[PDB]
Amino acid sequence: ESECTLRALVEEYNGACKEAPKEMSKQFTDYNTFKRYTTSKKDHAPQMRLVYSVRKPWPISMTPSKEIPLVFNGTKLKDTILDLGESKRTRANIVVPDYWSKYGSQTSLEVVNAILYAEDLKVQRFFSTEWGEIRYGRMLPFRKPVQACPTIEEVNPASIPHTLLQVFCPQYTTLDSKRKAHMGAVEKLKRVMEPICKVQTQESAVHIARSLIDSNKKWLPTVVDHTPRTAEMAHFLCSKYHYVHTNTQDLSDTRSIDNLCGELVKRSLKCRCPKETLVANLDKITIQGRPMREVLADHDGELPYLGICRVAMGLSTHHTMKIRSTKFSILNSDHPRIEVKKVFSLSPDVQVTIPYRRFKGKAKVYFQNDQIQGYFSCTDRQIDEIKISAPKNAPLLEPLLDICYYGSFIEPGFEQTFGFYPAGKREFVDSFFMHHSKDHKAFLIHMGLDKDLSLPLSPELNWKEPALSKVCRVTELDSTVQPYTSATREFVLGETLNVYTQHENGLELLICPTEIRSTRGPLPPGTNLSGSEFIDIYQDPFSRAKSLLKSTILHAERCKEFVGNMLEEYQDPAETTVQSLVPINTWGKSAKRKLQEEITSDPDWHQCPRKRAKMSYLAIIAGSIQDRDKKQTNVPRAFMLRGSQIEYDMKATRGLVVDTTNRIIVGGETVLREGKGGPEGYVQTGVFEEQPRCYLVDTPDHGLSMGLSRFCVHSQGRYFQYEKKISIWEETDNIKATIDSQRDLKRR
Amino acid sequence: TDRPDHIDSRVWELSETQEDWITQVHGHVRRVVECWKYTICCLISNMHTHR
Amino acid sequence: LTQEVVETISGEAKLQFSVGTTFRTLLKRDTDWDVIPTPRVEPNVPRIEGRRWTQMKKLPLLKEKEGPPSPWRALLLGADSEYIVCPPGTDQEAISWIHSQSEIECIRESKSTPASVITCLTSSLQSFAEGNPVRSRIHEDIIAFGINKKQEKKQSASSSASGEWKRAEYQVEEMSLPPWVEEEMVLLRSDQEDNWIELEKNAIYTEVDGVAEGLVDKYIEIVGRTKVASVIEKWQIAATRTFSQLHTDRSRITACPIITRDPSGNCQFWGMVLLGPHHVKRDTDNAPLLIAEIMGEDTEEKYPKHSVFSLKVEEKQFLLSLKITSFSRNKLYTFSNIRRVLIQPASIYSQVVLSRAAENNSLNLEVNPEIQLYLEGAQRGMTLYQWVRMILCLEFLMAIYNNPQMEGFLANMRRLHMSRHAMMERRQVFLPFGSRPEDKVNECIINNPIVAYLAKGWNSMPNVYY
Amino acid sequence: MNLFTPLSEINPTTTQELLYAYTGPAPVAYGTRTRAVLENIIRPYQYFYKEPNVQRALDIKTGCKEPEDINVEGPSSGFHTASVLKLADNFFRKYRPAMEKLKYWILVKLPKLKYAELSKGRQTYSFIHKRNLPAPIALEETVEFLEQNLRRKIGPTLLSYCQAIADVMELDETTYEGARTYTIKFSREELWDQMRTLNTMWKHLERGRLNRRTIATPSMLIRGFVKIVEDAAKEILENVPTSGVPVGGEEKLAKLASKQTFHTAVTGELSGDQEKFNECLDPDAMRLMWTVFLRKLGCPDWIMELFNIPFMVFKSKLADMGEGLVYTKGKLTDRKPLGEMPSEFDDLVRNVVGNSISCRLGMFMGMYNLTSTLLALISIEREELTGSHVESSDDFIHFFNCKTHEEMFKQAETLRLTLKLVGINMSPSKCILISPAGIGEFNSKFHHRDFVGNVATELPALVPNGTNPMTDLAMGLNVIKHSVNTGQMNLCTGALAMRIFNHAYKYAYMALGVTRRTRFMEENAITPLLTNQGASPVHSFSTMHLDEVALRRHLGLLDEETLRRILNPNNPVTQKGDPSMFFRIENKMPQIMEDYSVPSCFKYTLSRNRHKALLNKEERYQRVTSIINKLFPEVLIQEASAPGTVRESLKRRLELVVERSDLDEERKKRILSRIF
RNA sequence: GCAAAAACA
RNA sequence: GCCUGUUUUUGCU
RNA sequence: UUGCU
RNA sequence: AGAGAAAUCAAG
Ligand SMILES: *O[C]1[C]([C]OP([O])(=O)OP([O])(=O)OP([O])(=O)O[C][C]2O[C](N3=[C]N([C])C4=C3N=C([N])[N]C4=O)[C]([O])[C]2[O])O[C](N2[C]=NC3=C2N=[C]N=C3[N])[C]1O[C]
């Protein structure tokens, strides 16, 4: 039972106090130092003694036991005669493990499964990837950091210690640690380690848990666009002389997060100062139960919109400049890529402008596309040298044209007009590519021809192809060239959500919206856009109405603002949602009048959630798309959402909102539970070294559910008594308001 | 980075160029304390209007 | 951070570090500046007249030392090693068979190893005939293992001591390249009946595994049936058997027979190693050994310290080495893992085959291209298989002859190798003012026969590239 | 050599791996180190002047010399003060992000450095016992010395440790009183001598050099001071393009490949070493460079003083001479100190302090690899040099992109002269410049078109260790796997190394031939079923990373009948001598303590044949740490922050956990009754 | 964090 | 006997 | 006691 | 004797 464990702990504490009168009068924090004193575990060289050690008469040291017989068939197993009883004293032959492999006590099968679980994952992962065909090509290595082993979940490092504490020791955690932990990873780890912790010690179990949810990236040479996104099978799938063509989908939610970030960026650019708008929204949107900042910190991807949102939160990004299929990286340059605001006015009064970018000074840019890779050195707009490594007879049209577009070296399409007046940037760039696809003579006239036949580039852009003349200043790559950055880059998020890289003589553009092309994709599961200002992102009318109602009901100030903006035709951040939820009708003025009676009769309405629900219902009907022809009629008790059979009710007796005296449920989820679990959260309110006069809950969970107004939690000998939150606003909103007022007062 | 979790990002950014923390005793702790004072000032002036 | 926060709140603000008065005086004793130096000189970088970089038009010529030819200074014989075929059984049975059917006759006696110690070996045989690898001391052991030799030498030196104290001034004798190195290279490569490399094949699950094991099998069958493999097996067996008997203190004589086994099961007697009274306190100190082993051919200039005996067994004649040596624990442990020397020639072979496969985008696994090499001062073609074969021969020869001279020579030869490789590609090599890259190599060429062999090989090839 | 120079298929660079005599014995040092130590002491004095004048160069303190004093045709010990100032100014003006990172490290990372990091070191000289002791032992004895001499408690931070070291030097006398019983006393001068004392010893088993070299180590009284400087130097070096020391493995190769750009008309590559390094660098130059760095950053005076302590201490370094130069009368070999009879080191007799010798010039040791790297890098920054430089400690590689050959020659000579302006001398015999770039060497890594693999740098690790069969197998397979991934060994070499390691591993555990283990297994019908038991190998080339037991179970080679036996958590073979604690996920009692065994029966321990009292003190520390870990699982994931002393904290935690045991009241009272 | 092993400077 | 720095591979707390 | 091709 | 290479081992 638990009683024996308590006896053991008490006896161990008594022994430590008695055997070590010192070493315990020290501070507890001193454990951070004297835990590092682990001498006497040192041996000279075990590799130079193994052969002799195995062949000693009694090599194996083990604790005394009766399971191993003193003398087995013929042979004597254990040397239990000399000093039996001195801890790890008994000495046994090298054959004792062999004797135990047979003729030994067995164990239940679930224990064996639990012991081998971590290794069985690797075994089936190896015997599950489709083994392709070996291709030999004399690979040119690309040295990059890759993740050592796959993870069950992606958790940012700062959240690793809090996640594990939520799995093994919830009873010694605070609500801040609970909020900083990844609860999906917590649940997965609990399910995984429930059998594992029965056969593994505390430190071992922590080790396997962290190894399951840590990245531990290491530098390895991989092959371009063939990385197995994990070093687990790198020794098998690539050996500098071959690769095994393997097929594997993304198997991740990074694309969905990119879709969400792209929607947020696109909708943020349509308002004043998009940067502050995006930063404010990202601090109020949550995916599952995790805030958007932490999930952005979790997914450090290669995608543009994800990089923009990570930079907006103060994080870094790994995005690189990419033109269609070719990726570019500036090895070094004298000055950043200067923008040119070249105007191609269609008329003296009507003007259309197509800004572009170029190099001012000397620059060197590495490029790669498919198996082709190399670099080019240029001065201003004149190309100086090109080094290329590519398979023989490969077509080098698209990489060279991507280089030309990146540097604006070629000017049938830069500094001048093709012909008929371009419609816009999209059409102009497409015309550039389609014209230069069939006309590559611009490259030839740009860098001339050479009479030397050793140059590998053919005039028709084929690598190492015999011809009459060869393209000058394009040669095979001498030594391996790869982009490396020494100082950690810090990114600047400028207006229009432009992600710049801090170059010495200015700012280097890295990501620029308005030319990022990506179709709309599914949102991440569990996305909760009920924060503010962005609800139309949801395509489903169900969730679109649910988020709006959750915003209105759970916040009295939001309900007041919504009613005020929806009654007097003010600017409401959710006008599109209201228009798309209610069909064309003639109930506007009637609903507005009803709002009038219910605001005049009870001006104190915005504290009863039932009143908030009724007011929100009337306001949503009031600002619907009013029909032009039909006359106004009385507001119906209940109506129907657009393109769905979902019924919305005034009294909330049925349909989307159900408000029973015990609780209010919106969209099948209990938004309000009367009596326990108030709408507003908790604040820490006190740290003490002694038990406060409150109720000590077992864990952060089993708290926040009883709805107590005073409860303490324990953490490293300290007590934290969370009480309640009574302020209607939030610290982030308070700071934002104060800073906005200060900046406005500075400007005014 | 060096920002404590409880300190808001905007407050941390605003406090970088307010005092020369390198020459002060416990410059990081002094900056954190100044951020505490500024956050207290923000919490005192929270959505309160008079005229 | 509670203490720091409370300190900042209170405002006492201790500077977190301060140097006192007397400590500052102690610090400023051996410097012309204060704790924080404030020189009164204007920051400026002057212009210094420097020298001129000179092109290395021709590769340096490594000097060859002059003196008596170097003897075979190694633990075992090498290419001269032979074995005796014995009926299948244990080591004790094989030794009992040999001892009861053997006649020993001295045919060449060396002053370094007196012939009278032969009895020791026979005594050890007797001891190992009845299963006692450890035997009591006999008189001749004192001569064989140098028992109490240090004390006797100290007394003799004290008796003969005269003059005035002077510094050490040690001298290392310089010896020339011996003729037997080329014979060792030519030998040690002849084909053998058995494979002599029997390594358990790894599992095969994927096609990558299949091609890897195919390459390994090809390498094994091109370097297996070679005298190098047999000598490597002999060296590894002897090193392990002698090492396993050295993790203790003994005042008696231990026998460590060198016996291998063929696939047919018959024992192969390469020799025996006798470990004398050893009380090792460190891993680098020497222990006495008496190495008896079978020769194939006797050379006076190659084995001056070996006392050759004629051994008659079942109407068969053999030769016996029986040299006195002192050898260390670390060296024995290193030679216990001498099988690792096969990797480097395998590295060359695998690199050639895989480069050809990548060039043709398909694996052949049977390519034997024509490597161009400077053979006798002229560039001639040569098959890859025998190139790998004597690369293995030379790698083994260097591994057993690794000393500080060899380490320094090989470490400093890499720059010259890179310079030669650069100049064969029409690349010019430029050097600083006082640049003599050959001196750092020449200082390591003293008496090591294989260092001299490598130096001669370097000198033979052309030094000027057009 | 002709066998190592192919001309048709592969280039000589790929045969650089054949110029390695490894798998043979490594040279060792045998006798007295005094000669080597005295040579290292006398070399800095011989290079200060163009002509060798040791006597005139022995009375100088700061090795600053005029530009015309600097020797251009040989090693030059010393620096130019104005050159160092200007070059540090130029290095600070450039690489501003590195200086911002330095400021962040000073503000943030520096105050949180813990002196327990000093425990990470190796054999350290002890000023108490005058002997080399393990780093934890020396750290603990020094901490106790400071505790009982200053009559206060040292904070866990390294700044508090350095302040304690500074304070203890103010006292006239100090006492240790170890009480293993024994009491020793120190004066200010004695403690000063002990702090600035470097114990010297031979470096054994070192490959690649003809002559044995001597290594040194100081006491814990200055290691802490050097630790801050090393951390700051690492922080600066991680953010500068020209550094090569803080990056290693594949990252260093990627950084090198980033600079192998050859586009101009003339593209040369110079690979070389620095001669007489670690003895031509004056620590005063490092003081000046660090002072400039911290002064342009606006740092206060205490930062400057702290950064200057270690170099000032090493300016007064007392290198411990060995046990005496060897002298011979006839065949005798006696051993005498330096001053007894004349030798080639007579001029240094005036510098003998006891059994040690003082050395003002040079640095004699490699405690400032990072700082010496920074000192090398600051000299690079000038308008004349336009190439790309990489410097780790004393191995450098430079890439010149020049229009004309004479411009490249001028740039190379300027590079040499700037290195000489600081106290770093290019080794003329070890510096090779190839005027068409593409072939080069750096840190024993050779490149022609790509960094070629270096076999024989991985063979010394291809030996089983002495832990247990499973650990040995895992370590060998993973070492071979890393070698394959790095590119040192390819498919065939990887598989051959696997087979050789498998054969050695089977032999080492009596799994080949007819042994006692094999006879026992055969006479009892015990089929092997495992690699260490002589069964056929289960690991393939592609299964390097897979565990043996799991793979055999998956392939069916290991039935559940034997799996339930070998993986028994109660087997007597690997049963621990003490009960252990276990978590319980979603259970009423999340803490269960019981007897445990290592699951695999083949993960046993090998018996061993049969600072003394400090070992008992450390055993007491082990006991306290074990009880803390059992009672405080949360510090198992995060740092310890519980208030109060250890005794009171564990008492309160024990009362709390018993209170949450869900047992009845009487159980709880009689349990808390017996707590001491 | 600790222990062992290896490589490089 | 077995320094410092960097990197890497294991296992244990 | 002693068996690596 | 020998191993060995800038000085040691060859036991008490
Ligand atoms: O140095 C080292 C560190 C590093 O690592 P990372 O990555 O950072 O992670 P982490 O751990 O989290 O960090 P920190 O925070 O600093 O720490 C924490 C804490 O807790 C402990 N631990 C941890 N872990 C993991 C562990 C522990 N313990 C035991 N017994 N086991 C385990 O596992 C520590 O100590 C602290 O206090 O970190 C650390 N580490 C890492 N790893 C490890 C460690 N330690 C120990 N062990 C291990 N295994 C170190 O420092 C401290």
Residue numbers in the entry:
A (entry chain C): 8 to 755
B (entry chain A): 2 to 52
C (entry chain A): 157 to 622
D (entry chain B): 1 to 180, 209 to 638, 645 to 710
Quote the study that presented this structure, word for word.
Thogotoviruses, exemplified by Thogoto virus (THOV), are capable of infecting humans using ticks as vectors. Numbered by size, segments 1, 2 and 3 encode the PB2, PB1 and PA subunits respectively to constitute the THOV polymerase. Although the 3 polymerase subunits show low sequence identities to their influenza counterparts (∼15%, ∼27% and ∼19% to IAV PB2, PB1 and PA, respectively), THOVPol exhibits similarity in overall architecture to influenza virus polymerases (FluPols). Here, we report a series of THOV polymerase cryo-EM structures with resolutions from 2.3 to 3.2 Å to reveal the initiation and elongation processes of THOV RNA synthesis.
Cryo-EM imaging of this sample identified THOVPol in two monomeric conformations and one asymmetric dimer conformation. The asymmetric dimer is essentially formed by the association of THOVPol-EL and THOVPol-RE, representing an “elongation-reception” conformation. PB2 627 domain is resolved in THOVPol-EL within the asymmetric dimer, but is not visible in the monomeric form of THOVPol-EL. The ordering of the PB2 627 domain likely facilitates the recruitment of a THOVPol-RE molecule to form the asymmetric dimer. The PA putative endonuclease domain is resolved in the monomeric form of THOVPol-RE but invisible in THOVPol-RE of an asymmetric dimer. We note that within the asymmetric dimer, the opening of the product exit channel is directly opposite to the 5′ promoter binding site of THOVPol-RE. The THOVPol structures therefore are the first to confirm that one polymerase functions to synthesize RNA, while the other polymerase functions to receive the RNA product in the asymmetric dimer. Our structural analysis also shows that RNA elongation alone in THOVPol can trigger the re-configuration of the peripheral domains to facilitate the assembly of the asymmetric dimer.
